[PDB]
Amino acid sequence: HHHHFNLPPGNYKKPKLLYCSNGGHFLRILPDGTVDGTRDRSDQHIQLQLSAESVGEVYIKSTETGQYLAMDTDGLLYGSQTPNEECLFLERLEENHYNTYISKKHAEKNWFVGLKKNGSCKRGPRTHYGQKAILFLPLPV
């Protein structure tokens, strides 16, 4: 293990919105595979279904498009049509409150899913423990 094992409360029964504290954006997976953030609660591409692989491991999938959130070799988030090793994330509790998502593939590097204040996604290597960009709150849709 490269990381702690404090898990967030909750389950995967229903889809969620992943709200980023940093700029107040919801994680969005565009039909074209693009990943970013939007403040529009009405957006049809912010509804995500999480599911667990192993305990503490998840897939994050677009309910609208079926695409899986994934982080590439260069730390860029993208929408994948099929589930692959780049699609697994370590879902953890952070600051005793939020949810963080660490790239399983790149766990040793501490690459997280994160959103900038301007709503653009952070590149893996630019993320790190202690940032606001990596903090998410799962909200019901």
Binding residues: 22
Instruction: Mention every residue, 6+ apart, whose C-beta is less than 8 A from residue 20.
Output: 26, 27, 37, 114, 115, 133, 135, 136
Distance CA 72, CA 76 (A): 5
126 in Cβ contact with 109 (< 8 Å): no
Range(s) of the domain holding residue 20? 1-141
Distance CA 55, CA 88 (A): 12
CATH code of the domain in which 3 resides: 2.80.10.50
Distance CA 103, CA 109 (A): 9
Instruction: Mention every residue, 6+ apart, whose C-beta is less than 8 A from residue 62.
Output: 29, 45, 47, 48, 49, 68, 69, 79
Expressed in Å, this structure's resolution amounts to: 1.6
The conformation of residue 85, written as its DSSP 8-state character, comes to G
Domains in the chain: how many in total? 1
19 in Cβ contact with 48 (< 8 Å): no
Binding residues for heparin: 22
